[PDB]
Amino acid sequence: KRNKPGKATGKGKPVGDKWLDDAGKDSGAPIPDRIADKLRDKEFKSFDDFRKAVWEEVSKDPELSKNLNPSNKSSVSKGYSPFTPKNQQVGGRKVYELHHDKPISQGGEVYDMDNIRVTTPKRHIDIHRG
């Protein structure tokens, strides 16, 4: 289902400067409302294509991008996920990861931004653990 086309939906939430700090805690950080406004109703061939669009929009957003350093700004400008702080990295997983709150395996929506969270590798592994 991650590789079937869908249009992006949902509202997201207001965020601040600590947006990506929240990705290491609880259920992760929300998709920002400002990002949801840009991506709603666009069609994506796959979830990977959506992921790329998220980071490109972050690169272009003057409130979200200001809290990334020059090297991380370069990364998001390419549509790559930015690098997390070292202690949130796990092996070769060193960048922020998108997470579905209601699992896709359980009929969770792939492209509904209200069902998506931004996580660090460490937090993402821990959420799925059980």
Binding site: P70, S71, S74, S75, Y80, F83, K86, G92, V95
Partner: protein, 83 residues
């Protein structure tokens, strides 16, 4: 050629750091490979933070990063760059 710091001249190492800082790759995978390589080369306890999460006061230009690495290795009993 790229097995250790001592295999790189300072100029060659600056080229590597510049490529990383500019995300001058064809994929996210390629960039992650380069950052991992940097971490393994420098042996600096901060790892990727030298590039992405600089300590207050540190110069996070490519030149600044190279000098932070060079100074740390010099102060901590490690071998230096080639020439």
């Amino acid at each position: 050629l790229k097995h250790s710091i001592s295999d790189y001249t300072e100029a060659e190492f600056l080229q590597l750091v510049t490529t990383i800082c500019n995300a001058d790759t064809s994929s996210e995978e390629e960039l992650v490979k380069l950052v991992t390589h940097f971490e393994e080369m420098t042996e600096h306890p901060s790892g990727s933070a030298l590039i992405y999460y600089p300590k207050e006061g540190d110069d996070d230009s490519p030149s600044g990063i190279v000098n932070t690495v060079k100074q740390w290795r010099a102060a901590n009993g490690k071998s230096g760059f080639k020439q």
